[PDB]
Amino acid sequence: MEGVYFNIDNGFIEGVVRGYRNGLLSNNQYINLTQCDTLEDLKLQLSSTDYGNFLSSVSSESLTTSLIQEYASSKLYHEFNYIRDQSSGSTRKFMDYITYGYMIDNVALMITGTIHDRDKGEILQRCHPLGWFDTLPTLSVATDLESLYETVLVDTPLAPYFKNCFDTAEELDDMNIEIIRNKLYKAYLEDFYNFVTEEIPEPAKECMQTLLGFEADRRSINIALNSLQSSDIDPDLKSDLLPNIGKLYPLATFHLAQAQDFEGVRAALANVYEYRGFLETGNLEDHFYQLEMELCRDAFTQQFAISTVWAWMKSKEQEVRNITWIAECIAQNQRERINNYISVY
Amino acid sequence: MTELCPVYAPFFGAIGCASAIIFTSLGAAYGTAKSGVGICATCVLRPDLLFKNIVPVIMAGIIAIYGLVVSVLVCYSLGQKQALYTGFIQLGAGLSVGLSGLAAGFAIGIVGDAGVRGSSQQPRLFVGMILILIFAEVLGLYGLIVALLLNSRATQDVV
Amino acid sequence: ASVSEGVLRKKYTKFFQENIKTHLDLKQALLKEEKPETALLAYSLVSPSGYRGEPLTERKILEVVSLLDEVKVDGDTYQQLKNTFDSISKDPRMQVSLENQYPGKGVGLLVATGRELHKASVNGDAEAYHHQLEQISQLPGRDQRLSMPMQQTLAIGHAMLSAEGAVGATLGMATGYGLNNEVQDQLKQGPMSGVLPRLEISNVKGDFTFSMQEPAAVRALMAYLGPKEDTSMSSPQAPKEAQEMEAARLTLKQMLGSSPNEHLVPDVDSLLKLSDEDMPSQTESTANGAFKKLLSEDWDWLMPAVRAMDKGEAGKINEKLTYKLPLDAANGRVYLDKSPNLSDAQLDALDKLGSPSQLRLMYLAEGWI
């Protein structure tokens, strides 16, 4: 069984991340945060949680909605960097593969910001400190891709993912950079699924396979619903943007690659059982966040598994989205939709 | 059944006859399969280099004829009342050409698929492919020379 | 917008509901509506030889082909087809066309398996040639009324011969009916082919009647429409019976898309070749070799080359059919390009032919050039 060899190098990590799980805000703590009047009341009410004394040394009057999520994210990222420094062998590779997906978003953000002639220093902020890679600010030169890959991207770990990307030889606009980002993310999800299948042991293997399948399915549905808009894409040129894994791959990605209107997407998801309750709703991303949280809650029942390191990392990032949504309503007096946070724990 | 000619003496020559054609067929099979993947992936783009690119498969097919001409000569020197010395010589003649052909077939397959994938971008690489495949081809011919020099001594001065 | 079809058998479901299994009073149950100028015309497909010596007086196909001929939207094109066909079944030139395409009316295991696999592959390539030939007549300027059911018959016969060859090779290799019937009814589904008139023949031998949904009659029809008209048979100096059959032959040959001075003789023989009077004009054989080079190297290079050639752009063929594919070599993927390397001596000959006639492209897909 799995507990025999797991705790030789991952027992301290397991115990620390389960203790990190225990600081997730339950449903009553969000109600107590919702009842706050001003933002100092939100600070006092968050001081009685496992965030406690993190907005110390700020002010009583320099407290802003942006600053709250900056500090609440920096806490999360220091915790991730603490767990990754205590890992070795296969867990270190697992956490580097978690990091690469943020590196891709930093790459697309830097290339997009270079085109619109703006400052390098303002693209270097708002640029997600977890996927850093020290040679990143060198991407602000030489606005075509062939002078990017041949100078700075071959040394990055994103270098194997630029295989399907060299069909243009010109400069870049907002459409081409999103095509490059979707192709990089396809190659990333397929390589990380292949790493999970061949090298992670079983109770974490099946959990990470269903979590990465959910990530691939959400990418596929959003690429299909962002391609029926004011554009014209050949249907075999769109099947190169959909990842080859998940539970809607071998049939429904054939139909999503050919959907011409909004009713072609509802017809493609009508056959899959876990979906087709999603396209008649309020928000569409509030189904994906809810289903991701029900998947992450189910991953905390497996006790000897490193999927927990995923399931914590996505849950805590949901939590920082909730607090901001409360802090955007207290600072702006918009209490009408304040109870639309997403809470499972 | 003497002491220098037992009854289990044709065992070594019989599994030396079989081991010659077995291990050259595995080498020719890898040299045909590994090379024929790269030919069928390249003549999609360039359908008129097809007879030009067939030459590593012909080079891999020569290796099995080496094992065939060793196996048909060992077989005509087999007998019921032969010596153990003859059986040892026929084992050596089988295993030399067999494992030399196995290594030559591995080399010809791995060189040949990269050569036919590279020669279709640069036409001045097809002569370098043949030049490397001649060096990979003669590694089976050395085992053929050894197998023909052993078999010449199997029944020279044997009682 | 030359033709349209449908495949739902529930709209005119009155004539197919009960056990109407008799040609006797089949026209009497055919009125059934306000159909007066559109009821007796649909019966005319089965009127001459549909009772006079008819087996079973109906079948499943012979009655379903009569009510899929809804002609209520317009009845002019099929009326001209009914006047053009069966006005062509008088001359002996049509009679000998229906005789060359008709009868009188161990190591041997390796050799037999080689015959059967050759049959499978040769009758399997031509089905693909005809599937990329029914999208050439989808292009503007063509027709879809006489071309579409004519080359949807030949693909079915080639698919049946291919399945017959594969079943024969499998049954011969595994040893040395229910499988051929399973592929026969499977090709009967999908779309619905439009009707063509029946071509009854009454000569001194008897009253014969062919079908035009069988590939032998289709293959015998296009050999008749081949040759150009001669100095006779069209002049107003022997006006005996030629202005009703040779005008019909020429309007069919033009309805395909062939000029009245194009020869197009079939070349499949074991004999000596096309001598000199039926031999092409040296700017046609070069063009035919260019078409055969287009067919032999890609499954999608005939329709865009014909689309470019109808626009007079037949010198731009080398740079409009080029496309790039990847090659995972020993130094990464390289994205080479496949292109049809036409020589110049066959790139200007495609300028000599203005538009490819559909009759030439159907001899090309059947193998007669």
Side-chain angles (χ1 to χ4, degrees), chain A residues 274-322:
Chain A
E274 191 62 30
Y275 298 102
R276 56 84 183 173
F278 286 179
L279 297 174
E280 55 273 16
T281 181
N283 292 113
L284 186 272
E285 64 182 1
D286 290 333
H287 282 284
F288 284 119
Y289 286 157
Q290 186 70 41
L291 198 147
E292 183 182 2
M293 285 298 108
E294 284 114 19
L295 260 58
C296 289
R297 180 186 60 192
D298 291 332
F300 280 112
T301 316
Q302 306 293 325
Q303 212 282 126
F304 295 98
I306 57 169
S307 301
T308 302
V309 179
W310 185 270
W312 169 64
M313 183 67 202
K314 305 286 107 170
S315 292
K316 191 72 74 175
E317 283 184 353
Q318 182 66 42
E319 174 179 351
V320 185
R321 282 195 291 269
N322 290 327

Side-chain angles (χ1 to χ4, degrees), chain C residues 306-320:
Chain C
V306 168
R307 181 176 62 194
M309 196 180 296
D310 292 333
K311 294 181 181 179
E313 296 182 355
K316 295 175 69 67
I317 289 174
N318 292 321
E319 62 96 19
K320 289 192 286 187

